[PDB]
Symmetry: C2
Subunit: 187 residues, 2 copies
Amino acid sequence: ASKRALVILAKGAEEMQTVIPVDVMRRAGIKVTVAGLAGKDPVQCSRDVVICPDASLEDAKKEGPYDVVVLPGGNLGAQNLSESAAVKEILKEQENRKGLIAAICAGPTALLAHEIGFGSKVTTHPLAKDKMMNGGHYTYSENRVEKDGLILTSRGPGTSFEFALAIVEALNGKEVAAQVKAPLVLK
Amino acid sequence: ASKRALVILAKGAEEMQTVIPVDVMRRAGIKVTVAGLAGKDPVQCSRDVVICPDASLEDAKKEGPYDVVVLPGGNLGAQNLSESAAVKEILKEQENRKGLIAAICAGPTALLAHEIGFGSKVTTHPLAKDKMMNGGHYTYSENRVEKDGLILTSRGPGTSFEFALAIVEALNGKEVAAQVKAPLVLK
């Protein structure tokens, strides 16, 4: 049995924070679905890379549940995630079933918007801290990857490999994470 | 005047090595064209991320020359680059005009195939060393990024940020590279 990941891809997502986790998770033998928030259509990311999702979010949800739901960053992508009732329902359901949620950079601010994981330690991009911390519902961390049980967060493009490998470790264990890491040529 | 980059995107390319350089170069204010080897159509990368190119290679070439030509890795992507007469012509012309060529992971093996940059120090992914070194036409390096004048090479997914920032430094200078680097949250 392989583990399954849902990566929710919205217009304005940080493309590095979409592709690095998708690719590293696939290297780990996780079955990853790249789901488009807005539909099946191609998604224009924050730096204009255009990615074709595997499925619409509507369709991907019918094929769940997933062992992890992953929220990339990029401020505009994160805002689109935050404004989506469909994302609210997916995240609520994932929390309710005690499944992992992982978010990077501005992505964790969608957790705030949807009232997910309050009382957790979290990190974000430094520039997203004040937004995430509005109301004091989370405790902030400067660790490059933070994991407080089922809420896994990270900071930026440059922490994306660490973020992805932390997801791999959570789902498939330390040994698999180490095996996937070596061929990447990380320092 | 802004600097211009051509990123040549073939089926089986390493998607992290496509997106990280495109995104970081765009952050640096470089005008980047993602050109599809095979045409305008979407490209299925090595770990099944599907990227829509900006233009066909045929069309992108008419809009050159470029300050850098970038070759992502992924073994199958690199082989498709290596087998393309169009890539041969672009790389020959770039070399002839004394323009920068940058290649990562298995990407430098396309330089071998097209007889580009012989006599240079180069690096590759460790697993691509023997292929690159067939005939002893280059001198090998284990540096994470190697730059021998106009031939800039790098090793793997985990060296892609360093690779991209080395391209930025070469085109736009150290100050711009440092400014682009800080918001990435690199260690």
